[PDB]
Design an enzyme around this catalytic site. Structure first.
Site, PDB file in Angstrom:
ATOM      1  N   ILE A  13     -17.252  72.170  34.872  1.00 47.50           N
ATOM      2  CA  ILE A  13     -17.432  72.008  36.312  1.00 47.50           C
ATOM      3  C   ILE A  13     -18.575  72.883  36.835  1.00 47.50           C
ATOM      4  O   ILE A  13     -18.982  72.754  37.986  1.00 47.50           O
ATOM      5  CB  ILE A  13     -16.120  72.324  37.088  1.00 47.50           C
ATOM      6  CG1 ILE A  13     -15.594  73.716  36.747  1.00 47.50           C
ATOM      7  CG2 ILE A  13     -15.056  71.328  36.727  1.00 47.50           C
ATOM      8  CD1 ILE A  13     -14.314  74.120  37.514  1.00 47.50           C
ATOM      9  N   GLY A  14     -19.101  73.748  35.978  1.00 46.84           N
ATOM     10  CA  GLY A  14     -20.205  74.619  36.342  1.00 46.84           C
ATOM     11  C   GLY A  14     -21.055  75.003  35.145  1.00 46.84           C
ATOM     12  O   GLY A  14     -20.567  75.066  34.014  1.00 46.84           O
ATOM     13  N   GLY A  19     -23.860  81.100  32.384  1.00 50.84           N
ATOM     14  CA  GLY A  19     -22.918  80.585  31.403  1.00 50.84           C
ATOM     15  C   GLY A  19     -22.379  79.235  31.844  1.00 50.84           C
ATOM     16  O   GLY A  19     -23.115  78.454  32.456  1.00 50.84           O
ATOM     17  N   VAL A  21     -18.578  77.097  33.399  1.00 51.10           N
ATOM     18  CA  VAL A  21     -17.234  77.154  33.955  1.00 51.10           C
ATOM     19  C   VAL A  21     -16.506  75.856  33.631  1.00 51.10           C
ATOM     20  O   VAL A  21     -17.023  74.764  33.873  1.00 51.10           O
ATOM     21  CB  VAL A  21     -17.225  77.364  35.488  1.00 51.10           C
ATOM     22  CG1 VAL A  21     -15.776  77.313  36.018  1.00 51.10           C
ATOM     23  CG2 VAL A  21     -17.954  78.684  35.884  1.00 51.10           C
ATOM     24  N   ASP A 134     -23.543  88.178  48.199  1.00 54.20           N
ATOM     25  CA  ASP A 134     -24.162  86.925  47.780  1.00 54.20           C
ATOM     26  C   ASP A 134     -23.432  85.742  48.425  1.00 54.20           C
ATOM     27  O   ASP A 134     -23.195  84.726  47.788  1.00 54.20           O
ATOM     28  CB  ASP A 134     -24.168  86.815  46.241  1.00 54.20           C
ATOM     29  CG  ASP A 134     -25.223  85.838  45.712  1.00 54.20           C
ATOM     30  OD1 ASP A 134     -26.147  85.475  46.458  1.00 54.20           O
ATOM     31  OD2 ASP A 134     -25.142  85.453  44.531  1.00 54.20           O
ATOM     32  N   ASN A 139     -21.181  79.617  46.715  1.00 53.87           N
ATOM     33  CA  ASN A 139     -20.219  80.661  46.362  1.00 53.87           C
ATOM     34  C   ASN A 139     -19.009  80.622  47.277  1.00 53.87           C
ATOM     35  O   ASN A 139     -18.214  81.563  47.312  1.00 53.87           O
ATOM     36  CB  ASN A 139     -20.878  82.039  46.409  1.00 53.87           C
ATOM     37  CG  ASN A 139     -21.782  82.297  45.217  1.00 53.87           C
ATOM     38  OD1 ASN A 139     -21.593  81.724  44.147  1.00 53.87           O
ATOM     39  ND2 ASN A 139     -22.766  83.182  45.396  1.00 53.87           N
ATOM     40  N   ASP A 151     -17.396  84.061  43.078  1.00 51.88           N
ATOM     41  CA  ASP A 151     -18.514  84.736  42.417  1.00 51.88           C
ATOM     42  C   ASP A 151     -18.801  86.168  42.874  1.00 51.88           C
ATOM     43  O   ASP A 151     -19.710  86.412  43.664  1.00 51.88           O
ATOM     44  CB  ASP A 151     -19.785  83.900  42.564  1.00 51.88           C
ATOM     45  CG  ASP A 151     -20.881  84.324  41.596  1.00 51.88           C
ATOM     46  OD1 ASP A 151     -20.770  85.407  40.980  1.00 51.88           O
ATOM     47  OD2 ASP A 151     -21.863  83.568  41.459  1.00 51.88           O
TER      48      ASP A 151
HETATM   49  C1  LIG Z   1     -21.022  81.950  38.438  1.00 57.60           C
HETATM   50  N1  LIG Z   1     -20.096  80.836  38.538  1.00 57.60           N
HETATM   51  C2  LIG Z   1     -19.064  80.819  39.374  1.00 57.60           C
HETATM   52  O1  LIG Z   1     -18.734  81.768  40.037  1.00 57.60           O
HETATM   53  C3  LIG Z   1     -18.299  79.582  39.554  1.00 57.60           C
HETATM   54  N2  LIG Z   1     -18.835  78.377  39.451  1.00 57.60           N
HETATM   55  N3  LIG Z   1     -17.860  77.439  39.689  1.00 57.60           N
HETATM   56  C4  LIG Z   1     -18.313  76.040  39.602  1.00 57.60           C
HETATM   57  C5  LIG Z   1     -16.683  78.001  39.918  1.00 57.60           C
HETATM   58  C6  LIG Z   1     -16.852  79.472  39.887  1.00 57.60           C
HETATM   59  C7  LIG Z   1     -15.649  80.417  40.136  1.00 57.60           C
HETATM   60  C8  LIG Z   1     -15.656  81.127  41.484  1.00 57.60           C
HETATM   61  C9  LIG Z   1     -15.681  81.419  39.028  1.00 57.60           C
HETATM   62  C10 LIG Z   1     -14.305  79.700  39.980  1.00 57.60           C
HETATM   63  C11 LIG Z   1     -14.271  78.226  40.351  1.00 57.60           C
HETATM   64  C12 LIG Z   1     -13.080  77.630  40.746  1.00 57.60           C
HETATM   65  N4  LIG Z   1     -13.035  76.312  41.068  1.00 57.60           N
HETATM   66  C13 LIG Z   1     -14.137  75.513  41.002  1.00 57.60           C
HETATM   67  N5  LIG Z   1     -13.974  74.227  41.338  1.00 57.60           N
HETATM   68  C14 LIG Z   1     -14.771  73.111  41.201  1.00 57.60           C
HETATM   69  C15 LIG Z   1     -14.202  71.798  41.203  1.00 57.60           C
HETATM   70  C16 LIG Z   1     -14.991  70.671  41.061  1.00 57.60           C
HETATM   71  C17 LIG Z   1     -16.397  70.802  40.941  1.00 57.60           C
HETATM   72  N6  LIG Z   1     -17.197  69.656  40.804  1.00 57.60           N
HETATM   73  C18 LIG Z   1     -17.043  68.555  41.765  1.00 57.60           C
HETATM   74  C19 LIG Z   1     -18.447  67.965  41.877  1.00 57.60           C
HETATM   75  N7  LIG Z   1     -18.869  67.735  40.490  1.00 57.60           N
HETATM   76  C20 LIG Z   1     -18.764  66.408  39.886  1.00 57.60           C
HETATM   77  C21 LIG Z   1     -19.167  68.884  39.646  1.00 57.60           C
HETATM   78  C22 LIG Z   1     -17.763  69.448  39.449  1.00 57.60           C
HETATM   79  C23 LIG Z   1     -16.995  72.112  40.950  1.00 57.60           C
HETATM   80  C24 LIG Z   1     -16.184  73.257  41.089  1.00 57.60           C
HETATM   81  N8  LIG Z   1     -15.316  76.069  40.623  1.00 57.60           N
HETATM   82  C25 LIG Z   1     -15.397  77.386  40.280  1.00 57.60           C
END
Ligand SMILES: CNC(=O)c1nn(C)c2c1C(C)(C)Cc1cnc(Nc3ccc(N4CCN(C)CC4)cc3)nc1-2
Length: 259
Positions: A13-14, A19, A21, A134, A139, A151
């Site tokens: 998802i990231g 890195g 996620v 940030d 975020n 983040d």
């Molecule tokens: C440095 N990276 C991060 O902090 C971070 N990045 N993401 C994407 C997340 C983080 C956290 C803060 C470490 C935890 C987190 C917790 N939940 C999500 N949820 C999420 C759900 C769906 C999507 N997408 C929907 C649209 N897309 C098709 C891409 C996936 C992106 C993030 N994302 C995250």
């Protein structure tokens, strides 16, 4: 492998230089978590510095409604793995992109809701004598609606700040001027521009003329009908004098927001 053993990986998802996620299900409790997985940084690097800020932010921060919950962290195969709350709505950045595509929008009310909810998050962080440093759409995450700060790699102490600047687009001038006497107000500055992004503003300048213009207290162009009243709140949040900006406290209790 603890990761393989305790979790089943569902989807990425990231991703970025930070890195990856992954959406994972924890086998024991059947719940969904977001697992950040990162190459262990070189010792004495900015990356290790970033990494350390996040560990100890967790150590200090408890749970909060408007902060992405941290559950655990560990290391294996020279990677660092952090288990977070999963926000099924994705980030505010994704939401804005979708709006810019589907052609919906955040009503003036929904903008007030976002300000207040992220405001509550900041109020809490600031109360633990920390600053996020940030705040920006990417975020801020969404659970379906609840807004949550994520983040924490730029988090530092209010008292003895170790400051790695956030995204230049959302950065207060005083922070660029190596003035760290009122860091909480940099988070306020940054929240205001985040809201302006949500309200459909053209992309924020990274530097040059328009960058400077904003830090004079000048709001980016909005494409929609906002009351002069909400406008002035957003305006004073980017006042060049950080002491004139609301604290998170004064924010969450402001007449315009409630509720
Ligand atoms: C440095 N990276 C991060 O902090 C971070 N990045 N993401 C994407 C997340 C983080 C956290 C803060 C470490 C935890 C987190 C917790 N939940 C999500 N949820 C999420 C759900 C769906 C999507 N997408 C929907 C649209 N897309 C098709 C891409 C996936 C992106 C993030 N994302 C995250």
């Amino acid at each position: 492998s603890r990761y393989t053993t305790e979790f089943h990986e569902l989807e990425k998802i990231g991703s970025g230089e930070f890195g990856s996620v992954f959406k994972c299900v924890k086998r024991l409790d059947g719940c969904i978590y977001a697992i950040k997985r990162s190459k262990k940084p070189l010792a004495g690097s900015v990356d290790e510095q970033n990494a350390l800020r996040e560990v100890y932010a967790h150590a200090v921060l408890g749970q909060h409604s408007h902060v992405v919950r941290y559950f655990s962290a560990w290391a294996e195969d020279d990677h660092m793995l952090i288990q977070n709350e999963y926000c099924n709505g994705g980030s505010l950045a994704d939401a804005i992109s979708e709006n810019y595509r589907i052609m919906s929008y955040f009503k003036e009310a929904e903008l007030k809701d976002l300000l207040l909810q992220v405001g509550r998050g900041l109020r809490y962080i600031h109360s633990m004598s920390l600053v996020h440093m940030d705040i920006k759409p990417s975020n801020i995450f969404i659970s379906r609606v609840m807004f949550k700060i994520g983040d924490l790699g730029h988090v530092t102490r209010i008292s003895s700040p170790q400051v790695e600047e956030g995204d230049s687009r959302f950065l207060a001038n005083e922070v660029l001027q190596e003035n760290y006497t009122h860091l909480p107000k940099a988070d306020i500055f940054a929240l205001a521009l985040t809201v302006v992004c949500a309200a459909g503003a053209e992309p924020l300048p990274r530097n040059g003329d328009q960058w400077h213009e904003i830090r004079q207290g000048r709001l980016p162009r909005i494409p929609q009908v906002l009351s002069q009243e909400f406008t002035e709140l957003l305006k004073v949040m980017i006042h060049p004098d950080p002491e004139r900006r609301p604290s998170a406290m004064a924010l969450v209790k402001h007449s315009v927001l409630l509720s």
